[model samples]
Structures are given as structure tokens and as C-alpha cells.
Target: ERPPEETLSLWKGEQARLKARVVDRDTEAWQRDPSFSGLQKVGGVDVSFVSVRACASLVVLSYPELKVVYEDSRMVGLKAPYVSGFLAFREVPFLVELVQRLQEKEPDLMPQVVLVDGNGVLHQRGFGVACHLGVLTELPCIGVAMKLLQVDGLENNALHKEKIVLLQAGGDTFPLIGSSGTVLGMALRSHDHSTKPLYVSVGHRISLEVAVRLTHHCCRFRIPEPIRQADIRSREYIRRTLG
Candidate 1:
């Protein structure tokens, strides 16, 4: 359906509202517990589209082992048109609903932290899809993307932040910093063999430091395992059933 001309302006306004909804504060301090202390299962969320149909999927794996424990998917109609920088507005609802259904359907198998295949705070307004899902679910999510995401003021220089760390993976080294804002996402070189790196961003509740560290731990190849599996499984589902 063609959206009204005012739709762009309305979504732009919605960005601020969603950004405000993002929980960037250190929730661990509030919980009086170390991050990932009791975490056992790590989950991944991904979505795919084929014409008017969309598939949203979630996969849970045993932490540190990377073994799949539970998997689920949902099929829905294309809810909104894809818009640049406003992706969360279009795509996040499906993933958000899947997460809620997973919790209700398999409460024990729900993940402690989720890896999402999209930007977190790497968007123009810092309310990317991962951030949207994280805020709505009240779960920590790490944004993992295959390509580097660029923001207006972002540069390739070493202009650093308080929590900046040099991540050296597969013999590639790069800086992961807090960036211009209090808590933006990070750029990470996930593997030595891959030419490009995965961008790591905070979705909600988790710190950038932990997000990148966990992303590294979850990698068996160039990308994080949960996300990689989510990617493969979603596409497989689409091919198997949709075709």
C-alpha cells in the first residue's frame, strides 16, 4: 500500500520516540549482578521477505557450546515498506512478536541475550531494528551486521571513548569505541579470513564492551554462530515452504 505523503514526517518523529524508548543505561548495576553471569542460552533473531510474505525466526543455543536448543518461526504479510534509516519502523514488529511468542510458548528456552542481524545504534537516529526489539522485549541484544554501517559523524580515526578497546580477531585489529554519543554501537573485525568486519551495536540493557566480547565468543566462523544459523535457517525455511 502507498503510504500518505505525511508518512515520512510521521516516521521521522517516531524515530525520536523509539530512541527514547531504548534502554541504554547499565542494567547490570541496577540488578546488582554481573553481566551474563547466569546466562545459559544465547538466542538469535532474523527476518526475510519474499514479495508480500515475511518470515521472522528465532533460534536459541546453549551458551559457550553454540548447540541449538530451540528454534521457532513466524510468517506474516509484509507489514510496511522498506525505508532507509527507518528500517526498525518497517521490520521490527515481526521480530518483536516472535520473541513474545517464544517466551509464552517456551518460557524456559527463552534466551538471556539475543544477537540480531541488523543495526543497533548504528542508524541515523540510534533506533535501529535491534534496538527496537531489545527495548520491547526488555532483553539484551547485540546488533551484528556483515557490512560496516556509517553514521554522519562517524570516522575511521582513533578519536576514542572511555570504554574503547582494540578487538583483534583472526589477526585483524580495530577499535571498538563508545563513539560520539553516550552509548552508540561498535565496529568489529570478526575474523581474519573475511575482508569486512561485523558492526557491533548495543540493542538495550547490555554494554558495548560485553556486546562485542560476546559477539567474538559466539563466532565459529566469520560471523557470530547464532546469527549465522539464524540467517541460514530463515533462508532455508523460506526456500522449503514458500516455494
Candidate 2:
């Protein structure tokens, strides 16, 4: 096998074609979403890196209530360096490994919908971490982000407004369409009480509507609760054990 860097270089070379494949792969998941009703088991994934070691947290929770059902984490030495557009190369293998391990250890605890702490199609190549993991696992995934990803037609403009922004469940807002004129994601105010907006995009097997609705439901704080918990758990694991 090629080393991590070389492997990543190869992957980046095919990034655009990969993005096309991702869009094609994503269509099947568009309407098949169970609306998080039949699938009460939802998961949130997040990673924290200390030095070259990655602390990946996978938190499975009961949907709607967002109560923790099962929590799993693992630490692995990462060979892949951080690259902006190729983030999946560095983080996804570990996450995929974690999920597969979960499948073996506790098969019943798998999540129906997974929310990732990264961008989905709202990326440079349109295949971000969320897109990658969803395709890799063939499971429904959502990408919830804490920052604005400037791409396509989504740019920082005063029209989006400020903390005065309104983010209600199923509320309307500016659509994040790309250069191809595909509605890749939505730039919505996920919280009316907060200042910044969470950038949500489709990963796989789901709709922007479903992604946003699920994201809306997962919110009790500025960040989606599942992702928030995963972030906390990952950072805490690294802190207590490594620090």
C-alpha cells in the first residue's frame, strides 16, 4: 500500500470525479430517510487530535430526546497529515474502523442516522468528511459544522443578518447552491439565541430538508447536542487519559 501522504495525493487527484460519484451515490439516500422516527438510534462522531494521536468519539443516542445510549472511543496514531480538502483521508478511516468495531461488539447499537462534526457537500470538492463517511458506511449521515464554508454561491453577506437571526425547525432561509447550480446545502440560523450559524450539508442517503430537520431537532445548544456530546467526550477522553 502507498504511504499515507502518497495515498492522499492520489485521492486528491481523483477528488472531482470522486465528488461526482458522491453525488451519484447520494441520490438513493435522498428520500429513503426514516425521519429519525423508525430509527431512534442516532450517532454523532467527532475527533480530537493530540500530537499525532487521534481520539475519536462515537456517541450513540436515542433520537428526539438525544439521550445517550452507548458511547465508544478509541485512540490511534495518525499517519495522515491534515489537509483542508482531503480531511476524510486523515479522519475517516479511524471513524469507519470504530463503527465496524461497534458493529462486532454491539451490533444492536448502530445508529440509523449519523451526524458528523464537519462539512458534507459544502466543500471544495463537494466530498467532505461527512460525504466520505456516509458513502463508506452506506448509512445515512449529516454534516453539522460550526463555521461558514465559503464556496459556490455562499458568501459572507449582510443579507444573512446577525444574532437577530431566526432558526426555527423547518424554517426558510438562504439556500447554498454551488457553481453547478446544485443546492448543495443550507445556511440557516440553527439557533435564534446564538450569534453564529451552523453550516449543514448532505452527506449521504438523506435530503437537505431531512438533514436540516434532524439538525434542528438535535439542537438544544448552539451546536447539535449529539455532536456537542461527541466533541466533549472526545476532548475529555484525550484530556483525562493523555494529558
- Clash count, one per candidate: 0, 1
Q: TM-score for every candidate vs. truth? A: 0.83, 0.85
What is candidate 1's TM-score against the reference? 0.83
Model 1: lowest-lDDT 10 consecutive positions? 159-168
What would you estimate as the lDDT of candidate 2? 0.77
Per residue, candidate 2 scores C-alpha lDDT tens digits across 3-73 of 56767668877665556545433344423566643657789998888747778889898976889988887
Best by TM-score: 2
lDDT of each: 0.74, 0.77
Q: Which 10-residue window of candidate 2 scores lowest in summed lDDT?
A: 22-31
User: What is the Cα root-mean-square deviation between model 2 and the actual structure?
Assistant: 3.7
Per residue, candidate 1 scores C-alpha lDDT tens digits across 44-69 of 98778764687778899997789999
lDDT of 1 at 29: 41
